[PDB]
Structure 1
Amino acid sequence: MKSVITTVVSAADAAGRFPSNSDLESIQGNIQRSAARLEAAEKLAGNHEAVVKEAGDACFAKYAYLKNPGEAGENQEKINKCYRDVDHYMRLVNYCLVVGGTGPLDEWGIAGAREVYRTLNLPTSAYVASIAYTRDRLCVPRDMSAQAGVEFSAYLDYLINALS
């Protein structure tokens, strides 16, 4: 997994030296986002149950032909299955913004993602309409401070630059 701690603890062992004082400087930088990033995790964990609907309804407005037959949204199960599908990606941004890295996403979300979408014919450009709608929705005065607006909005832009 990727984080601030486990990345810099690797090069201590993989070069065969002790814990330095430069890696001790690195966890100090994790303290400056510990009370600055984790407010967004408790934000969305009590907020997904209404935004799984409005961001699940966001893509079918762009792509009404998935309801159309012989397509990714040929039948209700993918969408009902389809709503469960999108509740795994930002289920991991609750796991990513609690750790400090993209660990729960680069090993559980993108690894093998383009290969189960070509074979099972799921159009990857509807996930770009699914959770990037929340990027165009986010209000820094009302919902949460601009520290989530620079970090929750960053981790989403990791994903659209991965499913494309």
Structure 2
Amino acid sequence: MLDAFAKVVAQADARGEFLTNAQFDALSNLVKEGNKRLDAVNRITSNASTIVANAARALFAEQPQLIQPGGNAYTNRRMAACLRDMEIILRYVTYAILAGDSSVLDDRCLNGLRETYQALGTPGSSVAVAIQKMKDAAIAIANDPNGITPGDCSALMSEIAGYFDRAAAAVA
């Protein structure tokens, strides 16, 4: 697993090189902006059950065939597996946010996930939609100006969006 710092170190080590000033500057900026990253992780983590439930309700309002009998989310066992999958993906995304690198999400969650759903008959495009709904909810929560010190989190929200988008693309 890599965080943003280890990624830069690994890239540098493969070339046998000390860090450049551009790399130092990028990592120092990540540190200086660190409080915002911690808030995003904290806020999304603290609201995770809400993000999952509302994204699931939205998914099934939009794709009612999933909850018709015979649909992939019909029976409480399959519905519970689906909700669990949404929470798993969200959990690994919060790890990527803390790390500032997608490696943990790629290696421990996304790798092989498309094939897993194909083998099950779970439609990956529906999982991608669930993920995108969680994205929008997580970012509205993480970027909410209420009860937080005013400042610009837009670069971080784009980074967060990219992790969600990368997860959706992995199953789409």
Q: TM-score range by the shorter chain?
A: 0.7 to 0.9
| Cα root mean square deviation, aligned | 2.4
The answer for the alignment partner of 1:97 in structure 2 is 97
Any stretches of 5+ residues in structure 1 without a counterpart?
Answer: none
Question: Is 1:124 matched with 2:132?
Answer: no
- Structure 1 residues 11 and 46: alpha-carbon distance in aligned structure 2, compared to 1, 3 A threshold: closer
For residues 11-47 of structure 1, what are the alpha-carbon distances to aligned partners after superposition, in whole Å with 9 as ceiling and x for unaligned? 3332334x33444334213214312222110001111
Measure, in 1, the Cα distance between the counterparts of 2:40 and 2:19: 32
Question: Is 1:20 matched with 2:19?
Answer: yes
Q: The residue matched to 1:71 in structure 2 has which SS? A: coil
Q: The residue matched to 1:122 in structure 2 has which SS? A: coil
The answer for the alignment partner of 1:82 in structure 2 is 82
Aligned residue type for 1:110: L
User: Of 160, 167, 170, which aligns to 1:159?
Assistant: 167
The answer for the alignment partner of 1:4 in structure 2 is 4
Measure, in 1, the Cα distance between the counterparts of 2:19 and 2:50: 46
For residues 54-95 of structure 1, what are the alpha-carbon distances to aligned partners after superposition, in whole Å with 9 as ceiling and x for unaligned? 112121112212222333224221111221111100111221
- Structure 1 residues 45 and 136: alpha-carbon distance in aligned structure 2, compared to 1, 3 A threshold: closer
Measure, in 2, the Cα distance between the counterparts of 1:146 and 1:21: 27
The answer for the alignment partner of 1:37 in structure 2 is 37
Measure, in 2, the Cα distance between the counterparts of 1:95 and 1:28: 20
The answer for the alignment partner of 1:57 in structure 2 is 57
How many residue pairs end up in the alignment?
163
TM-superposed CA distance for 1:142, in Å, is 4.9
* Stretch moving more, 89-98 or 30-39: 30-39
Identity of aligned residues (%): 25
- Structure 1 residues 141 and 25: alpha-carbon distance in aligned structure 2, compared to 1, 3 A threshold: closer
TM-superposed CA distance for 1:141, in Å, is 4.8
Q: TM-score, normalised by structure 1?
A: 0.83
Q: The residue matched to 1:16 in structure 2 has which SS? A: coil
Q: Equivalences for 1:109-148 in 2 at 5 Å?
A: 109-137=109-137, 138=140, 140-142=143-145, 147=153, 148=156
